[PDB]
UniProtKB/TrEMBL annotation:
Residue ranges constituting the TNFR-Cys domain according to the UniProt record: 38-80
Protein name: ELR1
Subcellular location(s) of the protein: Membrane
TNFR-Cys repeat extents: 38-80
From-to range in the entire protein, with total length: 40 to 141 of 313
Disulfide bridge map: 39-54
Domain of life of the organism encoding this protein: Eukaryota
Length: 102
C-alpha cells in the first residue's frame, strides 16, 4: 500500500488517521497534520480512520423483532437485541439482525 495502517492516502501523500470517535475535518499538508473533529451525535467511528464524516448509527427495527441492547456511541455502532420473548435467528458480530417469537 501507499501508506501504512496508521495513515491514509490523500492524493500522492499520506496523512495521519483520526482516532475512533473522530473524523477528518482537514487533510494534512507540509505545515499541518490532519485536523480531526468529533463524530456528530448519532454517528460513530470504531477505528482509526480517514473518513470525512462518521458512520450513521444503525436503527433497530421493531418489525424485525429488534430493540436496542446497547446504544450507539461515538466509537461503537448500535447493538440490537431481541424484544421480550423473542430470540435471534441471525447475527452480524455483536448485533442481532432478525428475531423470531418463541
Amino acid at each position: 500500500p501507499q501508506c501504512k495502517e496508521e495513515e491514509y492516502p490523500v492524493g500522492t501523500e499520506c496523512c495521519p488517521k483520526c482516532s475512533p470517535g473522530y473524523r477528518v475535518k482537514q487533510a494534512c499538508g507540509e505545515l499541518t497534520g490532519t485536523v480531526c473533529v468529533p463524530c456528530a451525535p448519532r454517528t460513530f467511528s470504531a477505528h482509526l480512520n480517514g473518513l470525512s464524516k462518521c458512520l450513521p448509527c444503525r436503527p433497530c427495527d421493531p418489525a424485525m423483532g429488534l430493540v436496542i441492547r446497547r446504544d450507539c456511541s461515538s466509537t461503537e455502532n448500535t447493538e440490537c437485541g431481541c424484544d421480550q420473548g423473542h430470540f435471534c435467528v441471525s447475527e452480524k458480530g455483536d448485533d442481532c439482525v432478525e428475531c423470531q417469537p418463541h
